[PDB]
């Protein structure tokens, strides 16, 4: 039993970017609820730029604000700040940050009629993923382990805030 991927990953990315672009104008599609499907990819992509955000506040602006204190640069510095920490900590949040950073900037550039930049960003992303993050992706089996990473959100006993039952007094 060897299931093959019908659509290319770039098509999914385009669907995600396109969806986000449509979501801010006219919601087109449906509401996936009760009905387990064999497509965790689209769900994972959605969660990649919706999970942490819904438990954050407005990462799309906050993350760019809290890190806007130090003199940065253009897009060449945005996606580069994600890879910066990737070099010394390929944690799940780094993979998510790398994807959301590119997706957000690309979606914005698409609306700004800057496909030229989008193509460059995507080109660099693919190159990086098949060069420096090649072994990492090979270890994670692509998005294999990622599917189990976004399974929950409140379940964490590493550094999660100790409140209520745990630490009531402080």
């Amino acid at each position: 039993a060897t299931p093959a991927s019908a659509p290319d990953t770039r098509a999914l990315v385009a669907d995600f970017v396109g969806y986000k672009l449509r979501q801010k104008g006219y919601v087109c599609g449906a509401g996936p609820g009760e009905g387990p499907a064999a497509d965790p990819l689209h769900q994972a992509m959605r969660a990649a730029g919706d999970e942490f955000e819904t438990r954050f506040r407005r990462t799309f602006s906050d993350l760019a604000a809290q890190l806007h204190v130090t003199p940065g640069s253009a897009q060449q510095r945005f996606t580069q700040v994600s890879d910066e920490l990737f070099q010394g900590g390929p944690n799940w949040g780094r993979l998510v940050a790398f994807f959301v950073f590119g997706a957000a900037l690309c979606a914005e550039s698409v609306n700004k009629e800057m496909e030229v930049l989008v193509g460059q960003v995507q080109e660099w992303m693919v190159a990086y993923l098949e060069t420096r993050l090649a072994d990492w992706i090979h270890s994670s089996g692509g998005w294999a382990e990622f599917t189990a990473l976004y399974g929950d959100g409140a379940l964490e006993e590493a550094r999660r805030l100790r409140e209520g039952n745990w630490a009531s007094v402080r």
């Binding site: 999970e51 942490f52 438990r55 954050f56 990462t59 993350l63 809290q66 890190l67 130090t70 510095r77 580069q80 700040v81 994600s82 910066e84 920490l85 010394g88 900590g89 944690n91 799940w92 949040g93 780094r94 998510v96 940050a97 959100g153 409140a154 964490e156 590493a158 550094r159 999660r160 805030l161």
Partner: peptide, 20 residues
Amino acid sequence: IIKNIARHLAQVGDSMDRSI
């Protein structure tokens, strides 16, 4: 370039996502 800055978004994102 700026690992300190990268670490900021990293740690903040990691903690916030998994319920800060």
